[PDB]
Amino acid sequence: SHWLKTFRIVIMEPGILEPRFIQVSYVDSIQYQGFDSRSGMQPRAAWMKQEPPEYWKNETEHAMGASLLARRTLIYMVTENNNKKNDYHTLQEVFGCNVAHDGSFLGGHYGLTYYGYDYIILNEDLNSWTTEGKVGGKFNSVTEGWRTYLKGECTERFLRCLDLGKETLLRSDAPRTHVTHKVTVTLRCWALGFYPADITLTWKRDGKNHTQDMELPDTRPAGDGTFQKWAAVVVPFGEELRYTCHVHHEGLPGPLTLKWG
Amino acid sequence: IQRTPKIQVYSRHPAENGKSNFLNCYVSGFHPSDIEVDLLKNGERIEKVEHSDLSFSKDWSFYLLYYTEFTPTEKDEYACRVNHVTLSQPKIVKWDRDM
Ligand SMILES: *[C@@H]1O[C@H](CO)[C@@H](O)[C@H](O)[C@H]1NC(C)=O
């Protein structure tokens, strides 16, 4: 399963004359475009350089448009909620289509916020909404528009993207793993440079699912397009070897087991 | 509702002394996006430092990745310094080599 999502942000800071607008697009963990009002619409993924300038012309034109619209809206809502014009205000919007491994539409998403005040959100039923707040609580065709864009243009946009980056987008880079011994002991299981980001790290006291007494951080980016993740536990000085960590990941021949070397 | 950033300082590849590399400062879960992020070598704010495009998570909180190339040494001590609307005084996280 895959996701093509677009993010829009409208920022208002205390003092800034005009609101800042930025728009980025991702195809799963990978960002491939980017537009920033504090400047046109640039590429972010190496493989994007294969598009016609007629493309970026198109794209930049759209972002240009969306931006006028977004700023107008943020200002509108800051008004409706009658908030201090000068100071922080943020408008965030996300939309995207969930496409299956076989080019078929699985689902989609759309959500908009005047962070902390209003929320307008398309439901999974992709047929209903979720108003929230002074504005947008008073939210009203519009639906079919998205049902379409998402099933249509968006998916077309996705498929076309996969066409151009399958090589790097569908790769499977296995974790380089290892363990580390720290004294207060605490054993740490490391998984590095893996892609996709879906991975699994667990410990076991004598082959038994050992929960609670451990630590489970959050996958973080290596910086090159792959990820990192770790998990650790606390075990009685010396009484170590009764613990083993199991790594599971798409790019491995099979499960991997590690103990304090 | 403002939310202070979570900071992680680490290397792309494992710290191999005298061996080139990349130093990352990952800030996330913060709101608003007005954030200041610095990479320090022994204290002096490092020059040319790139950072990822701003994006947000499901809970609408923001995240960014700041980084630079760098050849660590057993002597050099590095760290990340962050200032945010939710911090009284800038937060400083020293890069632990074994983390
Ligand atoms: C052992 O831990 C795994 C980790 O997800 C869990 O799914 C499983 O239910 C546990 N034991 C079993 C097989 O019931």
Numbering used by the authors:
A (entry chain A): 1 to 39, 43 to 143, 150 to 193, 198 to 274
B (entry chain B): 1 to 99
Copy text from the publication.
Neurons in the murine vomeronasal organ (VNO) express a family of class Ib major histocompatibility complex (MHC) proteins (M10s) that interact with the V2R class of VNO receptors. The non-classical M1 and M10 proteins are expressed exclusively in the VNO and appear to facilitate cell surface expression of V2Rs. The crystal structure of M10.5, an M10 family member, is similar to that of classical MHC molecules. However, the M10.5 counterpart of the MHC peptide-binding groove is open and unoccupied, revealing the first structure of an empty class I MHC molecule.
